[PDB]
UniProtKB/Swiss-Prot annotation, chains A, B, C, D:
Chain's gene name: Rep68
Coiled coil regions in record: none
UniProt binding sites for a divalent metal cation: 83, 90, 92
Residues of the active site: 156
Subunit structure of this chain's protein: Interacts with host TOPORS. Interacts with host KCTD5.
PV NS1-Nuc domain boundaries: 1-198
Protein task: Plays an essential role in the initiation of viral DNA synthesis. Binds specifically to an inverted terminal repeat element (ITR) on the 3' and 5' ends of the viral DNA, where it cleaves a site specifically to generate a priming site for initiation of the synthesis of a complementary strand. Also plays a role as transcriptional regulator, DNA helicase and as key factor in site-specific integration of the viral genome. Inhibits the host cell cycle G1/S and G2/M transitions. These arrests may provide essential cellular factors for viral DNA replication.
Protein name: Protein Rep68
Motif (RCR-2): 90-92
Motif range (RCR-3): 156-160
Location in the cell: Host nucleus
Amino acid sequence: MPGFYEIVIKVPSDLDEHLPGISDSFVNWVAEKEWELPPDSDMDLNLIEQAPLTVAEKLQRDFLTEWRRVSKAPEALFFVQFEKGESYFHMHVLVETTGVKSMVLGRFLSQIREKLIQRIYRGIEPTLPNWFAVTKTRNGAGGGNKVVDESYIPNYLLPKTQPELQWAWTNMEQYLSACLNLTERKRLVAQHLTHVSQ
Amino acid sequence: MPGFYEIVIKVPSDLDEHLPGISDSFVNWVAEKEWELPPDSDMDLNLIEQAPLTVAEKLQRDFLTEWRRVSKAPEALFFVQFEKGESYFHMHVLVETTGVKSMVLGRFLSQIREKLIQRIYRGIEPTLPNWFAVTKTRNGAGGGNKVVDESYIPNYLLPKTQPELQWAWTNMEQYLSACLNLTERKRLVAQHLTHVSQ
Amino acid sequence: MPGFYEIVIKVPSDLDEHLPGISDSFVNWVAEKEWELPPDSDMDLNLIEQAPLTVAEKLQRDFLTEWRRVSKAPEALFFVQFEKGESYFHMHVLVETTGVKSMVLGRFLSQIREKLIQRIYRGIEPTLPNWFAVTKTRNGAGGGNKVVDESYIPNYLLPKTQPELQWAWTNMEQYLSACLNLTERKRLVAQHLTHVSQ
Amino acid sequence: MPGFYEIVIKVPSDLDEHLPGISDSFVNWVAEKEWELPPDSDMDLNLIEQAPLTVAEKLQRDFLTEWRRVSKAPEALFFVQFEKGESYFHMHVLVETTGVKSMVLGRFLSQIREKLIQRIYRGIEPTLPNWFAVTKTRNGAGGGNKVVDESYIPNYLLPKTQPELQWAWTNMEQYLSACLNLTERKRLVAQHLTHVSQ
DNA sequence: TTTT
DNA sequence: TTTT
DNA sequence: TTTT
């Protein structure tokens, strides 16, 4: 089975310490974009933010479009998950490694970061510590890219629920009902635990 | 029997920390060079890289051509082996000492390094720590060149298998089947161990 | 009728004053390329150079490919002419204005120059005075792009013959025989003079 | 007919102003080399020097060997002439343009100068004003290489006699007797004058 | 100490 | 070593 | 990627 990558995206949450010299048009366009909830979900109307989700969905859509334009393959699997943190809001992704190798991944990631800066931030570099970086295999000096197998999502992304879990955009067929429903996620976690117990 | 030399070559694996200011033509020509596997081998389709092997074969071919042009002898024995490492990818070579002495070897190695920089990197000096250096006999100050006898390959290059072993280019007659097959390598290792046990 | 643009390209002719620090691979590839003459031409074997023509044809082919890739239109009219000068060798072009406006032409020309520098010279900027520039309408401060109509080629490019004329690559149907033959060029000049005399 | 090049070489004539810090081995080897005169000549035993001629013949032999090694053609025409000057001794050459173009001539001349410096002076650059340079066509900025046709030798090198003429090394068949004999040179000059008078 |  |  |  083809491997997957893990790219963490940090979403800011301040205007007087994270985005210096911000404009009124950006916040006016962000705040004027409300969202609703599907009837086949199980979330809360007060535990889900608006502007952070609105910018996270735009960032993930821009990343997906950039990946589809670079790899020239619209049928690319992805699994984005916005998980609430204590210091800064983080978002994980599971992009397949079909096409892109590993040595050229650095230049592609740099170009994606530059495009996201010139698009969302309109050419403004935030002062967040390593807000756009990738993980490695934790070696010494010059470690390779960390790969993601199948036994990684049900042990680090599925058990994460409220209030940590915010929104999960899937693409697989066996995860259409386990995106916003906690019962399907718990069933999948139990199935994985019973499978790995053999 | 004539001795052999051991020259280690370090292959980079990053574009935003190893090759500053890398043009797009180089990576476009490197990524657009796929390779296949021979039917008389025993490797894996996922444990073998593409771009690292593609640049390593080009580097070893350039080194062989430069050695044949300098020594003016096309019948030169060689044994290149690309071994995977923890920090950086390394490649060992076993070039015979027919023609070149030892004092002039430094200038020849410097010229070969300059030619490889002006050819592969097109006049770009990488920031890798001692990426192009030779080994010595480990003495005090001003040690001689380390020679390689016959009892060196089956104890440091043959036991190295997957996932450390990537590709082994041979030239001898008794090593044609022990290049990509693990059974022949194990048989040769056992034969050497039984021979040195007397 | 759609207008045309006039972009002058300067070709160097020195290695110890124009291209500081040039590798031997470039000159080795340039010197190993010989061209012949078609039987339906009328030129000289001594008045036509080799390396300047060989680099000019490559530059014009790269420019045509870049224009076809940017404008996304392979059916683009062009008329390149390499004219010998007293100070530096110059080459004129007649690219149609189908697709590209005038305000975005500056960024496109800058990108084309950067690509030609990173491809031919491979990250080497020559010290020639304004070797890559475009002409204007000669006004005050902020003149627009100089357009080229139909009454411009037979009065500035057709009368230019030997030894000034080196090679003329056309694309029109009425100029297929007036590329290397002086009789057709003289006939076209006489026809234009008789037409403008009314 | 193929053209010819004109490269002027300046020969020093001082040790305490031209070659600072010169070893005694050079002058010891120069002074220990005496030359004679052929019986089929017409020169003088007092008007012909020894050390300038001895270094000029070695310089021209080294230049001829370097040209034959670079162009890979031993059958190369040449016509060297050591002419006495008022300021510094100069030597002219007439090397054919078979093989070498004009753009790569600069790098070849620089390499020849570097080899002559590292071989004759053993890596010592003299302080003579432009002692190793080539002539141009006298234009503005970026003039090409000055070519030498047939009507150039009998009007600038043949009339130059004693005490200006020192030694003329030829290679042609019609100039074997006009190398050291003034009668043949005068006859050739008269023939050229009668030919150009038509 | 130079066409070994 | 540049229309693989 | 600007009269959603």
